[PDB]
Amino acid sequence: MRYAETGYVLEVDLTKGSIERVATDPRDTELYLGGLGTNAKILWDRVPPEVEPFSPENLLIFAAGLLCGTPATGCNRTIVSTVSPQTKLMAFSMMGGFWAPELKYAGYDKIIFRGKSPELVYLYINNDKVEIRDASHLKGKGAIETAEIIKKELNEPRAQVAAIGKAGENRVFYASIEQGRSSASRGGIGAVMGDKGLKAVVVRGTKDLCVAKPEEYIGLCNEVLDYIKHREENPIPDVMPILAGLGSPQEMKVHDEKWHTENFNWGNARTRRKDFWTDEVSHAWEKTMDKARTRLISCYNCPMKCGATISMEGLPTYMMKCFTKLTYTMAAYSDLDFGLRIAQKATEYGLDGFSAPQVMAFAFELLEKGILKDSDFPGLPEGNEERFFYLLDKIVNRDGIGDILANGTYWAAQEIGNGAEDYAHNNIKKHEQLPLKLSMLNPIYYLMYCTGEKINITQIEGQFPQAPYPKLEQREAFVEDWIQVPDEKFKKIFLEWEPRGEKSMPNFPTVDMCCDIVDWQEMMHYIDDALGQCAGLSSFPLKPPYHIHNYPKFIAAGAGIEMDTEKLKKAAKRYRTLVRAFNIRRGMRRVDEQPPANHWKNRFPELEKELLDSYYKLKGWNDDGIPTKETLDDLGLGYVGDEFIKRGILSA
Amino acid sequence: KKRIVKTINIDADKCNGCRACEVICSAFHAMPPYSSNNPARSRVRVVRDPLRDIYVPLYAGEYTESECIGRDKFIIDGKEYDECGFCRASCPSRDLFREPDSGLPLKCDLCDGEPEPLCVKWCLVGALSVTEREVETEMEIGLESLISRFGADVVADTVEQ
Amino acid sequence: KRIVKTINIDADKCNGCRACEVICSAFHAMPPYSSNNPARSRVRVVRDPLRDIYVPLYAGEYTESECIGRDKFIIDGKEYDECGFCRASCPSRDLFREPDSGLPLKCDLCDGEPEPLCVKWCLVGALSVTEREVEEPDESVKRTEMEIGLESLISRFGADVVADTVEQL
Ligand SMILES: CC(C)(COP(=O)(O)OP(=O)(O)OC[C@H]1O[C@@H](n2cnc3c(N)ncnc32)[C@H](O)[C@@H]1OP(=O)(O)O)[C@@H](O)C(=O)NCCC(=O)NCCSC(=O)C1=CCCC=C1
Ligand SMILES: Nc1nc2c(c(=O)[nH]1)N[C@H]1C(S)=C(S)[C@@H](COP(=O)(O)O)O[C@H]1N2
Ligand SMILES: Nc1nc2c(c(=O)[nH]1)N[C@H]1C(S)=C(S)[C@@H](COP(=O)(O)O)O[C@H]1N2
Ligand code: SF4
Ligand code: SF4
Ligand code: SF4
Ligand code: SF4
Ligand code: SF4
Ligand code: SF4
Ligand code: SF4
Ligand SMILES: [Mg+2]
Ligand SMILES: [W+6]
Questions:
Q1: Which long-range CB contacts under 8 A does B114-117 form with residues at least 24 apart?
Q2: Which CATH architecture does the domain made up of A250-435 adopt?
Q3: How many whole angstroms separate alpha carbon B152 and alpha carbon C165?
Q4: Per the CB < 8 Å rule, is B18 touching A302?
Q5: Domain A1-211 of CATH type 3.20.20.70
Q6: Does A294 contact B53 at a Cβ distance shorter than 8 Å?
């Protein structure tokens, strides 16, 4: 009997209309844990590179993490996977809320969608009962709106709904999937859902979900809760107030946005406004937020309550968390009020709030220089704010220039020509990065930008501090109880690291120290994304309650399989290396692993080469970025190497 | 005579809707304890509707063998609550406070025997607390009322049952 | 299918007049309208002007025992009473029990009458009764107030003293 995982998946062919429950291999759980890890294994040996994103054979996968549905705090994440229409690489994407737990109580670990439905439909799951319902009456309805109509329809007030808005239905390349206060936002999974004619997935679950060693397990949970209490009485000293505590970035609670508005670039990641955070602005924005924030609310089984319901006058309520609070405001050079308003529309439409704002700022910079004319904007309103509303609607319906813009800055530029390419200056692998254009090369972040498979700086960082402390005393205070470090050497690094001088960036930490740090930071995300654990209590914040030393205990008591610290490291390596193999098979090479040319004012060609050289070797990869035969072998990935040799990816 | 009355104090203004209370109450009451969990089995159930700003933890009350002739439904301070929205009853009209497999009724016993209500313990924002206080012939009259409304013949015949 | 009836209470319109309690108890006097007595009402208004709480509560189902723990809400800054929304005819309190005998009371929507009278007498329209079809069967064990009454007595005083007085009268 299986524990923690349900041990079954639902296989659905949207072309035939077929639905089937399948027992999973208990070995794939020992090897790859679950979530992202198992998602990747399925992609690897069911989606060869010949497959397009909007090919019927593309797979759209919904997965509950291995420990979702157990009592573990914050363990509630859904991992959605597919081939991205925008990057043409794997897109995995995470959604919090309450959906993944509900799927586990319904009895399933995943839903694998294949094919295309000729008519718009949605999937309905109530424990053992699974059917495909017609969805044509929901056409073009907002993602949250759709969820409420469906729940009335079926009389399932406690069902959880994941849906696409019109954005997805039109295959916008950065279309999201929305569920209450949660979103699978990036990489266009929303578009693949829409391409398949799938409007929503409704799940209701009332089955039990067991753990292997009950007393041992609830013990660890209580230990985690005790740590959450401690950690909130003790914020990281002298650190930006949003990044001093647990949770996703606490931007719904904290009104201090000095850090963001003064160091991140406005417009099309174009403008620094170093003195933006005045007392006047601070009060205006606080007034706006105080009035807008209805309640701070949590995902399933979590006390951190990072998100908030938002009510603007004359607009339906919606939910928000993290940086989307500022992206529309900063892209449009506007105020907090405007951001909250347009974010409501863009959430209902279902759009990636990181990519959308830059796509629109992108477009207007083109109108500015003349690369686009006024004629390409028929009926372009006069005011700045009206113009973002105007363009948002065109994009979401793919109307005229919107059809182009809806493909993202990379594809839009190469379609427009005339020099638009110069203005798509903030992509890595065809995916928009955060609007950051800093001064001095950061060797740690350099490696994360280049190599992260999520292609998003905010989902690979976290465990190691972003800046050093000026005083030795402060550093010694910090390493003192830093139990999370995989190894004592990370304390020593942070002790030596200084803001200025011999031991300052970009030459210190050393190349090898940077490789160790980035490896650790990324490993914890990959573990989170397999277990279903929210990064807010794990990989994202400093000194989390979940870490490399108690995670193996959680997996052993939870799922009933042997697990220790070293085996967990090797597991996370195994499917992080598998995700790598996938993107390699789809053509990714070292040449693609480069940050935007203007991402730092001060660059060091030779230092950068040594960094990436060294990181690959640590990964056990090529100098081309390909995992090697010997590495694939040690990891239990023999079939990867043999396939790589037959494709000529690796010489024999 | 002075006996003890226990009150579950529920500050719904502090509830974040996380349902941790449902997780731990069901988990604790699995057999063996913590061997599993399942919110359908929890004796605390949260009315949760973010779009109405409603977050109301509701505890399993008394068993009733039939529904009411009329179900109540409140509008209060602009919020339109659910039909029977505040009822504690383990009732035939719905699934709440009944096993989702056998339909058998559930009762909150304030985690009798334990050091502390587990739902209270896991509610880290402290929306839940439990507190204590001491508290301090008609038959004949009642029996008349019955005769006088249903008739002496009726009352008698029913006594034999 | 089968019909379900709902009592729609807009507590935001309630003015606390208790006219509802006046007419309910008056109708249920024997004979009808021969007396009245809010304590006998099957609708009882929770009424505290200082807390702006005006909440009409309808007599629900019978319970022979109190709950192990009583509940008490704060919602939208209002501190409600212990068991403040419970409809039960319960031994913990006088509501929905006859004041002079403790007999369980139950709203039956003025059955046999053209319309609920509380609704009728509430001129500001805080109250209304609507109905709808539903699919779920009525698995209720329907039981006459006649036998509910006696059963509460046998419960409270033992089947001995009760049988003693029935024949006696
Ligand atoms: C952005 C940041 C404040 C750095 O700003 P700083 O101002 O410190 O760094 P700076 O601009 O490089 O340098 C300023 C000046 O110092 C100079 N100089 C530098 N080194 C020097 C040396 N050794 N010696 C001498 N001089 C040295 C420079 O030349 C320059 O001089 P200049 O004006 O004359 O040209 C800090 O957060 C960081 O570094 N983060 C790292 C990664 C990152 O991007 N994090 C965010 C990722 S997203 C995230 O986490 C989110 C979370 C939540 C929601 C959403 C997102
Ligand atoms: N396992 C996991 N949890 C995660 C993340 C992640 O990438 N993986 N992202 C975090 C961040 S930065 C945010 S803003 C929230 C977003 O929650 P949502 O996906 O439900 O919108 O998830 C947090 N929890
Ligand atoms: N529509 C929408 N897009 C969004 C967000 C969101 O909450 N809603 N979250 C942003 C933040 S703060 C993060 S960390 C990422 C999370 O990426 P993912 O949802 O693909 O995992 O999406 C970004 N885009
Ligand atoms: S830390 Fe925040 S985002 Fe993460 S589960 Fe808790 S409430 Fe949700
Ligand atoms: S644990 Fe607390 S905040 Fe969470 S749903 Fe229960 S009472 Fe509300
Ligand atoms: S749930 Fe409560 S109020 Fe509703 S019909 Fe049943 S006993 Fe009456
Ligand atoms: S006090 Fe105990 S029995 Fe009652 S709801 Fe809480 S955990 Fe369950
Ligand atoms: S008659 Fe209407 S307004 Fe008066 S107390 Fe009764 S319900 Fe409220
Ligand atoms: S009045 Fe209702 S909630 Fe209170 S003890 Fe009686 S049955 Fe329980
Ligand atoms: S509907 Fe009739 S029986 Fe019920 S409370 Fe109103 S007046 Fe009394
Ligand atoms: Mg997300
Ligand atoms: W984020």
A1: B114/B28, B117/B8
A2: Orthogonal Bundle (1.10)
A3: 11
A4: yes
A5: no
A6: yes
